[PDB]
Design an enzyme around this catalytic site. Structure first.
Site, mmCIF file in Angstrom:
data_model
loop_
_atom_site.group_PDB
_atom_site.id
_atom_site.type_symbol
_atom_site.label_atom_id
_atom_site.label_comp_id
_atom_site.label_asym_id
_atom_site.label_seq_id
_atom_site.Cartn_x
_atom_site.Cartn_y
_atom_site.Cartn_z
ATOM 1 C CG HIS A 254 20.442 10.186 -18.310
ATOM 2 N ND1 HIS A 254 21.726 10.140 -18.829
ATOM 3 C CD2 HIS A 254 19.738 11.025 -19.102
ATOM 4 C CE1 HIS A 254 21.785 10.888 -19.911
ATOM 5 N NE2 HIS A 254 20.574 11.437 -20.107
ATOM 6 N N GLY B 246 17.266 15.641 -26.692
ATOM 7 C CA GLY B 246 16.899 14.502 -27.552
ATOM 8 C C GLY B 246 18.103 13.827 -28.203
ATOM 9 C CB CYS C 51 20.752 11.692 -24.509
ATOM 10 S SG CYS C 51 21.296 13.165 -23.619
HETATM 11 C C1 LIG Z 1 19.893 14.017 -22.767
HETATM 12 O O1 LIG Z 1 19.777 13.077 -21.683
HETATM 13 C C2 LIG Z 1 18.833 13.939 -23.830
HETATM 14 N N1 LIG Z 1 17.573 13.464 -23.397
HETATM 15 O O2 LIG Z 1 19.016 14.264 -24.989
HETATM 16 C C3 LIG Z 1 20.490 15.378 -22.426
HETATM 17 C C4 LIG Z 1 21.050 16.267 -23.558
HETATM 18 C C5 LIG Z 1 21.212 17.661 -22.928
HETATM 19 C C6 LIG Z 1 21.364 18.860 -23.866
HETATM 20 C C7 LIG Z 1 20.174 19.555 -23.191
HETATM 21 C C8 LIG Z 1 19.943 18.307 -22.336
HETATM 22 N N2 LIG Z 1 21.431 15.219 -21.352
HETATM 23 C C9 LIG Z 1 21.088 15.397 -20.071
HETATM 24 O O3 LIG Z 1 19.969 15.627 -19.670
HETATM 25 C C10 LIG Z 1 22.160 15.235 -19.049
HETATM 26 C C11 LIG Z 1 21.714 14.149 -18.069
HETATM 27 C C12 LIG Z 1 21.284 14.891 -16.814
HETATM 28 C C13 LIG Z 1 21.579 16.355 -16.996
HETATM 29 N N3 LIG Z 1 22.322 16.428 -18.260
HETATM 30 C C14 LIG Z 1 23.070 17.399 -18.720
HETATM 31 O O4 LIG Z 1 23.660 17.257 -19.759
HETATM 32 C C15 LIG Z 1 23.171 18.685 -17.941
HETATM 33 N N4 LIG Z 1 24.559 19.035 -17.752
HETATM 34 C C16 LIG Z 1 25.090 19.263 -16.560
HETATM 35 O O5 LIG Z 1 24.429 19.169 -15.550
HETATM 36 N N5 LIG Z 1 26.386 19.571 -16.553
HETATM 37 C C17 LIG Z 1 27.229 19.870 -15.396
HETATM 38 C C18 LIG Z 1 27.182 18.348 -15.017
HETATM 39 C C19 LIG Z 1 26.641 20.316 -14.056
HETATM 40 C C20 LIG Z 1 28.747 19.772 -15.548
HETATM 41 C C21 LIG Z 1 22.470 19.892 -18.581
HETATM 42 C C22 LIG Z 1 22.598 21.112 -17.674
HETATM 43 C C23 LIG Z 1 23.123 20.305 -19.883
HETATM 44 C C24 LIG Z 1 20.969 19.593 -18.733
HETATM 45 C C25 LIG Z 1 22.430 13.878 -16.742
HETATM 46 C C26 LIG Z 1 22.067 12.603 -15.963
HETATM 47 C C27 LIG Z 1 23.808 14.479 -16.493
#
Ligand SMILES: *[C@](O)(C(N)=O)[C@H](CC1CCC1)NC(=O)[C@@H]1[C@@H]2[C@H](CN1C(=O)[C@@H](NC(=O)NC(C)(C)C)C(C)(C)C)C2(C)C
Ligand SMILES: *[C@](O)(C(N)=O)[C@H](CC1CCC1)NC(=O)[C@@H]1[C@@H]2[C@H](CN1C(=O)[C@@H](NC(=O)NC(C)(C)C)C(C)(C)C)C2(C)C
Ligand SMILES: [Cl-]
EC number: 3.4.19.12
Lengths: 302, 302
Positions: free
Chosen positions: B41, B143, B145
């Site tokens: 992603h 960050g 991830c």
């Molecule tokens: C990383 O990808 C990163 N760049 O460090 C990141 C760490 C989180 C903590 C703030 C952002 N993870 C994501 O971006 C992750 C990628 C998208 C959206 N992500 C989420 O973790 C989202 N969670 C979420 O949508 N949870 C539910 C799924 C609806 C149960 C956040 C809302 C926390 C951003 C993907 C592809 C899932």
């Protein structure tokens, strides 16, 4: 989100750990430049331990009684010295894995990463706090002596602890890297008291701030208090008295939560006074005092 | 003595962490041999995140859209591939700091060390358990991830987790290093349930054994129980049902404490039934299920 007891990465410190054998005793050494540092009681027999004369005991020892190993490599000692409660073993080779480092003496309430070792091999890493009574609550078995505690600031390792001995409860005492004990401890197997340990109030507030940032808010309350009023409810509960630096150091966390330090102090009072009633804050059923404001800022920002 | 949440030393894994930028997204990569592994992603925009077609999204990407950095060094991507939810970026250079490693898929109830990174830089290390519901409770900011979880067995790093996403409470989900999610999670920003998490009963017993070895005995009781009787008081309290392997795995700890596993199960029942009454076991006011029998043996022997 999420909030965990987190140690610094241990890599820079792994490459500095050696084994040190004198007579029968084997323990850990810190090899920086052409100097291995270790606890001076590596020269003691089980017997000497009860009432050692270190000067006298060390006179009987010569460079070749000190067997320093770095994995499979052995190091020629070319100089032994005593600085307070540590042995400096001058060796021929400079550790090529020597990082930018400093020796600092940390203050009660500050935290650092311990890399616990056995036979010069790192087995694990965890965070400790220097307690107000100058003990730590670590994990140190026979062979752990000479394991060190450190901070990484920038690219620079700040060595601040070396493990020497265990006190009744299961609590640890040791030295800075110049070999001065933290607290009233001597490297002699004879009855010594730690005496009364208190809670690091500013660290407990730092942790309540970490809670709020992770969404745990239930303890947040409508009331406030004065510094005097609260600090009279602190000492009741054996808590380090809260000063105005403590307030000014919580600024970054106050700043980020939009919660005044003294509102937060009033939430603490009701938890000290009404307990936690079977609820948890950050997965803990008690008040946590082993995170500094900086520990919380580092983790809760990046 | 002493008993702490302890991570493996992080050194071998520090030298494998790189930065990975595609378009605007930057996160962490694991560089082993001529292959950087990261979450797929990294190719998504804020928008794509809601309902990505990864195949389609990746077609628009070419080797030169992937900016891999190792400190100051940049790496020529010469091949991009997708394996389930991870990107394999074939690079020109083999990581010279590549350790003996394996990729394993760990089982619910097992623990591992997370090295949390930002912009390819390790910032800290802590221990997690794979929860029965295949979540972890970590510390992962934007960050984080691509940060990985690992065991060190012998000299051999067993990579078992890579961080992808956060779930409502503040709980983390990710993949093994072949890119299969632990649990029912997909890398799509759309409502997903973790569903009911239970306590790792065998780990709670391992921890009671660690308590006894450190002198905390007060909960030790005169009674005993059957496996059936206890296991009916387990599920009441949402606890993983105790099996006979669990008994046979506690052998080394039973062996060292001279306490039968089922005596210990009866001490647990009264704590599950009568709570802890404001007492602590190993500095904790609640029952700890994130230490395995092996974690306890490793720490409580050497
Ligand atoms: C990383 O990808 C990163 N760049 O460090 C990141 C760490 C989180 C903590 C703030 C952002 N993870 C994501 O971006 C992750 C990628 C998208 C959206 N992500 C989420 O973790 C989202 N969670 C979420 O949508 N949870 C539910 C799924 C609806 C149960 C956040 C809302 C926390 C951003 C993907 C592809 C899932
Ligand atoms: C190390 O030196 C080592 N080789 O690892 C060792 C670690 C401890 C844990 C089991 C042995 N420390 C000591 O041996 C230490 C050295 C002697 C005796 N030491 C103790 O820690 C003793 N504590 C003690 O006597 N405590 C009081 C002082 C009476 C308060 C033990 C009883 C734990 C062995 C010296 C010089 C203090
Ligand atoms: Cl607790």
């Amino acid at each position: 989100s999420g909030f965990r007891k987190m140690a610094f990465p241990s890599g820079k410190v792994e490459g500095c750990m050696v084994q040190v054998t004198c007579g029968t005793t084997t323990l850990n050494g810190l090899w920086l430049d052409d100097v291995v540092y270790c606890p001076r009681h590596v020269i003691c027999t089980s017997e000497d331990m009860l009432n050692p004369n270190y000067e006298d005991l060390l006179i009987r020892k010569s460079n070749h009684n000190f067997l320093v190993q770095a994995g499979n490599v052995q190091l020629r000692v070319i100089g032994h010295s005593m600085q307070n409660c540590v042995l400096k073993l001058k060796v021929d080779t400079a550790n090529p894995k020597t990082p930018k480092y400093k020796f600092v003496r940390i203050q009660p309430g500050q935290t650092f990463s311990v890399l616990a070792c056995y036979n010069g091999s790192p087995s694990g890493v965890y965070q400790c706090a220097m307690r107000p009574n100058f003990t730590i609550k670590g994990s140190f078995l026979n062979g752990s002596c000479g394991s060190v505690g450190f901070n990484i600031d920038y690219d620079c390792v700040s060595f601040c602890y070396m493990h020497h001995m265990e006190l009744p409860t299961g609590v640890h005492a040791g030295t800075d890297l110049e070999g001065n004990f933290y607290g009233p401890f001597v490297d002699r197997q004879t009855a010594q008291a730690a005496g009364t340990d208190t809670t690091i109030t500013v660290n407990v507030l730092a942790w309540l701030y970490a809670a709020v940032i992770n969404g745990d808010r239930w303890f947040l309350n409508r009331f406030t208090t004065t510094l005097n009023d609260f600090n009279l409810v602190a000492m009741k509960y054996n808590y380090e008295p809260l000063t105005q630096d403590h307030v000014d150091i919580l600024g970054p966390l106050s700043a980020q939560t939009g919660i005044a330090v003294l509102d937060m102090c009033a939430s603490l009072k009701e938890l000290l006074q009404n307990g936690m009633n079977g609820r948890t804050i950050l997965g803990s059923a008690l008040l946590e005092d082993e995170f500094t404001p900086f520990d919380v800022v580092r983790q809760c920002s990046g």
